């Protein structure tokens, strides 16, 4: 639970984006699932996260309008008690105590779930936990744990950004890379049982216990006191169970096990020389492993019965219990011994590429490891390792070697905190590195890592970091920040890379999310042949090195916003396409169907059970279930299962899977070689479905898309293109094309992040998250792909940049010369806040900046300016007192 102290309703142009809920980490990895980094996406914007905003339930960027007593957007002083259960598929919420009338169910149980709140800006929120971490205003539901009870052992609970590493830090950003997932021994048995029981009865006697089957503390009778020969049968079995476990683990530890006074109220135990004998540290570690196994079987038995610390594995178990178990289990060992028997690449923006001069920057290594630093041309690809291609010149200090189209030793190794500086003289075509302020010796007598290289495009600072690696970039905006500059750069006349630069360098890095890109002709194992009396798109791949490819058509078909013979053909809304699998391609690795724009899941293997699906069951004000809407980013059927028995060896023409989409009802149906499949799907209103097939390359010709039509069903192009909507002839306009999912994309870090004034303390009433800084950005939306990209990111996208520049030119032309009606029409598309942000923003492509300025001066400030300028020549003076004055 959590209270908002004061929520600004209209701090900015839009309402405050306040959502609370639970997010599931993807792939059981520390990387969480939800809004992408550096974007206006909160929780509930994908199948990974589930959110609630006071009036709507959010999942996959679509709201559900959940009803509740006094339904309204979250205002000040709202309890908002969220109850998460994962053994069952249900996540419920209660606004101010009254439960919401509808939960989420059948969400993908896998992955680690955590609470998460997207609080936009201009808000004040404060969580609640148990104990000193907060006050529980409302009582938890029966059989539920506290929020803080799930704290990791030996860890202090704290709150931080869910996925982004943004901290609003200048030239000190810890650009952390990928993380980690985060018969001969029967006498020995009897004698070991004897020794164990006598060791225990020594402690029993030290209290003053006697023997007897009854076990009463007042009578001090201990049945185990009697020797194993006369031990009672039940106590004998109890002792023998642990003796058997001990010797079984002794022989399973990888070492063969065979055969080779004190005050006594009862009898006199006679132990061997347990302490006298010396045991090697390897033996100690092996006995420790035995103790770990014993505690593991203990925990396995215990977990059946109460969230105790012992339930944690031995790795995170408390050291006190670990050591006690270790020594207790090692006592028997001593008795035996005595007897003798996704690497991330960051870089500066390509616009700051330098073709000449002397340049330097520093790279930090907080944790030594897979670190490479250097200069690469703009053509470098994120997937390829830095320095592994001719487009990149890198150096790895940990392995002490340079990388450019090959690996060659260079210099010595570095340690934690060893800054590496990059001397680059483009005029001299020299480039080398200074480790901790001293120049490396290369191999024999050289000092330069690379030389004699064509300038080509300007080289850009770049650094690649591997798993569990932390580094910092220092381009040299301020010389005082540079530490070892005065040792090397000052003497040799190398200027800092960004000393003259007025504003901080935008950083472009390899993005984790893979997006669908149009297939290129030069791409390996990717050849799409466009033939043509029905148009076909066949993929005859040749290299076939990659295992599984995901193919998607360029444009989708949208369903009706409200769900409900050539004549009936024209009235109908069903659209048909088909996929034909060429011989030699195994059908069981082919899945044919539809996807939305939210499918970014990538894996070496694809299964329909791994498809991200969550169904929200929205109920009534009376608690009665009425609607159960199921969401998914992938709707296909398996061609192998669709293959009719014997068609894998008897069908010479291959397998044809025809998909029919009825948009009026949101129904997806499949037909296999004229046989209707029992598998069908129902989609939500206003859903955009992309034709897509996933296939593993087993033959040169895998499969082909056919845009033909079946009787009484319109062709796919009719639903794709609005211009061709009534014509049933199949056509293939150039706009339609196949796109394969790829990881070769770059992402831009915003120069200004959303500063959060989180408490960062274990204060009472719960941790406080407050942010009163209004930050906004313009997002350009591609209607065809149903995706959004920041308008600042168009700098590296030349095609979108040019098209948008010409679109702004078209707006200016159509509203030019005082066309007031067109100006009013364009006022809706081009808004006043948009124009103000565009003109004010320092970071902006030049073409877009000029276009927005011209558009502003045309829609507004145009008619009056022109009329006044034209009138300026004339001079008419009224006969008034001011005129006389």
């Amino acid at each position, epitope marked *: 639970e959590l209270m908002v102290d004061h929520t600004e309703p209209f701090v900015t142009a839009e309402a405050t984006h306040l959502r609370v809920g639970w997010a599931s980490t993807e792939g059981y990895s520390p990387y969480p699932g939800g809004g992408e980094e550096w974007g206006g996406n909160g929780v509930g914007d994908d199948l990974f996260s589930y959110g609630f905003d006071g009036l709507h339930l959010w999942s996959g960027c679509i709201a559900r309008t959940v009803s509740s007593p006094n339904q309204h957007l979250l205002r000040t002083d709202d309890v908002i008690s969220c109850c998460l259960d994962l053994s069952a598929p249900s996540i419920s919420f209660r606004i101010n105590g009254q439960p919401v009338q509808g939960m989420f169910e059948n969400f993908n149980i896998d992955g680690l779930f955590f609470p998460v709140v997207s609080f936009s800006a201009g808000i004040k929120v404060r969580f609640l936990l148990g104990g000193r971490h907060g006050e529980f205003k409302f009582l938890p539901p029966p059989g539920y744990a506290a929020c803080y009870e799930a704290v990791l052992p030996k860890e202090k609970l704290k709150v931080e950004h869910s996925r982004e590493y943004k901290q609003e830090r200048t030239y000190t950003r810890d650009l952390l890379g990928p993380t980690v997932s985060l018969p001969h021994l029967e006498r020995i048995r009897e004698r070991l049982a004897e020794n164990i029981h006598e060791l225990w009865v020594m402690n*029993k006697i030290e209290l003053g216990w006697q023997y007897g*089957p009854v076990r009463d503390d007042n009578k001090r009778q201990h049945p185990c006191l009697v020797e194993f020969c006369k031990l009672p049968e039940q*106590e004998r079995n*109890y002792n023998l169970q642990m003796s058997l476990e001990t010797l079984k683990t002794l022989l399973a530890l990888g070492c063969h096990v065979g055969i080779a006074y004190q005050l006594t109220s009862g009898y006199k135990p006679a132990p061997m020389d347990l302490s006298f004998i010396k045991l090697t540290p390897s033996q100690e570690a092996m006995v420790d492993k035995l103790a770990e196994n014993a505690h593991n079987v*203990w925990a396995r038995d*215990r977990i059946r*019965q109460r969230r105790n610390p012992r339930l944690v594995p031995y790795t995170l178990l408390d050291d006190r219990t670990k050591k*006690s178990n270790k020594d207790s289990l090692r006592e028997a060992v001593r008795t035996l011994l005595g007897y003798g028997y996704r690497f991330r690449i960051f870089r500066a923006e390509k616009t700051y590429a330098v073709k000449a001069g002397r340049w330097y920057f520093e790279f930090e290594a907080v944790t030594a490891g897979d670190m490479r630093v250097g200069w690469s041309r703009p053509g470098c690809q994120p997937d390829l390792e830095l320095g592994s291609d001719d487009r990149a010149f890198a150096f790895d200090g940990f392995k002490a070697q340079r990388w450019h189209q090959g690996n060659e030793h260079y210099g010595r190794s570095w340690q934690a905190g060893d800054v590496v500086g990059c001397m680059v003289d483009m005029n001299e075509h020299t480039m080398m590195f200074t480790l901790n302020g001293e120049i490396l010796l290369d191999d024999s007598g050289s000092e330069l890592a690379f030389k004699d290289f064509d300038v080509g495009d300007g080289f850009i600072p770049v650094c690649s970091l591997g798993v569990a690696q932390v580094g910092r970039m220092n381009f040299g905006k301020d010389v005082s920040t540079l530490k070892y500059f005065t040792i090397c750069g000052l003497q040799e006349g190398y200027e800092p890379f960004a000393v003259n630069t007025n504003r901080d360098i935008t950083m472009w890095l390899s993005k984790r999310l893979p997006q669908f890109l149009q297939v290129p002709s030069n791409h390996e194992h990717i050849e799409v042949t466009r033939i043509d009396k029905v148009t076909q798109k066949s993929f005859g791949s040749q290299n076939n090195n990659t295992d599984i490819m995901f193919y998607r058509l360029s444009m989708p078909i949208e369903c009706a916003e409200v769900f409900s013979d050539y004549e009936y053909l024209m009235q109908t809304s069903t659209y048909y396409y088909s996929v034909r699998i060429f011989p030699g391609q195994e059908p069981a690795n082919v899945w044919v169907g539809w996807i939305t724009s939210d499918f970014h899941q990538y894996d070496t293997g694809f299964d329909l059970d791994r498809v991200r699906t969550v169904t929200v069951t929205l109920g009534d004000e009376k608690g009665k279930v009425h609607e159960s809407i199921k969401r998914s980013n992938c709707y296909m059927v398996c061609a192998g299962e669709s293959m009719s028995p014997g068609q894998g060896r008897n069908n010479s023409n291959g397998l044809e899977i025809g998909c029919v989409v009825d948009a009026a009802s949101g129904l997806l149906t499949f037909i296999a070689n004229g046989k209707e499949l029992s598998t069908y799907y129902q989609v939500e209103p206003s859903t955009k479905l992309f034709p897509a097939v996933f296939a593993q390359a087993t033959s040169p010709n895998v499969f082909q898309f056919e845009l033909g039509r079946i009787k009484n069903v319109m062709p796919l192009s009719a639903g794709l293109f609005k211009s061709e909507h009534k014509n049933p002839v199949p056509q293939c306009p150039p706009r339609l094309h196949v796109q394969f999912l790829s990881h070769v994309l770059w992402s831009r870090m915003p120069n200004q992040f959303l500063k959060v004034d989180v408490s960062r303390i274990s204060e009472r009433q719960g941790w406080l998250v407050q942010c009163l800084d209004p930050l906004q950005f313009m997002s350009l939306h591609i209607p065809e792909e149903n995706r959004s990209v920041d308008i600042l990111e168009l700098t590296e996208q030349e095609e979108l940049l040019q098209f948008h520049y010409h679109t702004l030119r078209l707006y200016s032309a159509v509203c030019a010369l005082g066309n007031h009606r067109v100006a009013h029409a364009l006022c809706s598309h081009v808004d006043e806040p948009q124009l103000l942000y565009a003109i004010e923003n320092k970071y902006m492509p030049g073409l877009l900046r000029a276009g927005y300025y011209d558009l502003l001066i045309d829609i507004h400030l145009s008619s009056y300016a022109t009329a006044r300028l034209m009138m300026n020549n004339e001079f008419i003076v009224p006969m008034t007192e001011e005129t006389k004055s």
Partner: nanobody
Amino acid sequence: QVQLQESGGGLMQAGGSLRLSCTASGSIFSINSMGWYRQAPGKQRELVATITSGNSINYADSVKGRFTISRDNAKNTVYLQMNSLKPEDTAVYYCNADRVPNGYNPWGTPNDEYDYWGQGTQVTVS
């Protein structure tokens, strides 16, 4: 999973005879140390007389009265007879079967929590 079902503990006047039957059903391994735990409303939980295999009854401070507890290991069935009843004996009684033999554990923590706590019943005395 070893589940203990306890039936009995009706309500009558003091001095009456009360019969309680506890049956343990589950795994065939680790059957030992059946005990009764008494808890009064909002009061500390006490340990009632505990019987183990071999007719070994472990007594405590709460055994005052007329107790007759007998166990059979063939079906893991325990019969408890209360002859003398007192008003202070009104409490909930839980039947447990823990592998901790007779109430001692030389190993320690890896078995002190090795308890199969079954269902119980409320005994009321007028």
